[PDB]
RNA sequence: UCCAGGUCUCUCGCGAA
RNA sequence: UGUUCGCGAGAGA
RNA sequence: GGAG
């Protein structure tokens, strides 16, 4: 991915966009009860904690475009991945406007609790002024569709989130592309049935986990896998993606029947962006906030891995590849061991920078002990060993409970954290409840006992 | 003074028919 | 408690 | 930055 040009919106007539300059994150009641090292992300360029140039740092992810051509390995990847998906018998018809806007089996509605993007953002127009979920009215959307059309520019924001100390100072803040309501709608008309099919089929056929519940799904995953697992991390996955990857994705879509709308894929590959007082153009790179970015990045992951396997292990039978991606996150398996270290080197050839799974400083053997997916470990229940706990390390929970964007939400926030926390075991869970209840607000919260969670967990399998 | 800050998925909580 | 809808939040990608 |  690479910035083609950049210039101040003034020279071109695009309006300036102001994000709030301060974080909505404030220390919570439990700030001092738990240890933790993350703080609010750098949002502006005046920030004291900066030890480098902000804009330089945030746009640094656009490392360039390595390849431009679909080679034979990619083409074979394509064929294999397409052939897999054809077995799902995916409905290829357009999704109707009303279903696109207001959701249907497998695809939730548009979020009226979020920005409408360009150009509505420049007129104080919100989604709530256009959509109404109680009537499923499409009349004003259809008109607004005809008026502004599609392929509008994306508004770039800085994500307001916790961030590692190192990342704060080094200014490595993450960017959001706000997709236009128009484009979200047009995308869902074109691909909603694809989205639906994937959401209903988390697993090794889609090669995706979008639509799963980790509570339940974690017990399916080890059955789905092969004997030998492999995994790794990506560095700047989305922005590192070259246009060829977008061509191969089109090919897959042509293959499974979405051929008349692959042109939308071009709009993701070749995007224009408003950031504060600048307008810039990016060729390559998946924009983070477009419609289907979860589905598409995952699909593209399934193509990358097959391609590297073919490049690295000649003649490899891909029918035995069992992998599951969620965006750039992935857990893969083959009947015979595969060396992530070798794939990472082949990856360079295709513009991808691959590092060892979970920030380990060395490429080592992925096992059921140390593998992670969606930030959670795998741990069998001591009573019923075929039941697998998704286990998020307490540390992540600890970092979360220390901040809040609105103390109004304390009860709900902390309860949500308990639902994650208890898979760590009764000893750890009761300790967590202990530290929480060590402040008076803690004692005010209605918090689930371990026993309650375990029983409800077992019961949800039936 | 307020509002602002993407796409999705899952879950919990609340309100309704 | 089942569903179906609407709202809020948290987490993950 | 958007509306009062
Ligand atoms: Zn351009």
Author numbering: 1 to 462
Give excerpts from the publication.
The replication of positive-strand RNA viruses relies on virally encoded RNA-dependent RNA polymerases (RdRPs) that are capable of rapid and processive synthesis of the 7–14 kilobase viral genomes. To examine this in further detail and to validate the polymerase–RNA interactions seen in the initial poliovirus EC structures, we here present nine new coxsackievirus, rhinovirus, and poliovirus elongation complex structures at resolutions ranging from 2.1 to 2.9 Å. All the complexes feature an upstream RNA duplex that is pinched between the pinky finger and thumb domains such that the RNA exit channel is opened by ≈4 Å as compared to the polymerase alone structures. All of the complexes show the open conformation for the active site wherein the β-strands of motifs A and C are not hydrogen bonded together to fully form the RMM-fold that is commonly utilized by polymerase active sites.
Expanding on the r2 construct, the length of the upstream RNA duplex between the two ECs was shortened from 26 to 24 (r3) and 22 (r4) base pairs, and both these RNAs resulted in poliovirus EC crystals that diffracted to 2.4 Å (PV_r3) and 2.8 Å (PV_r4) resolution. Despite this common lattice organization, the different dumbbell pairs and their RNA-RNA junctions displayed a multitude of geometries in the different crystal forms; for example, the junctions in the PV EC structures range from near perfect coaxial stacking to highly disordered structures that could not be fully modeled into the electron density maps. A comparison of all the RNA-RNA junctions, shown in Figure 3, reveals geometries ranging from fairly straight and essentially canonical coaxial stacking (PV_r3, CV_r2) to slightly offset helical ends (PV_r1) to highly distorted geometries with frayed ends (PV_r5+2).
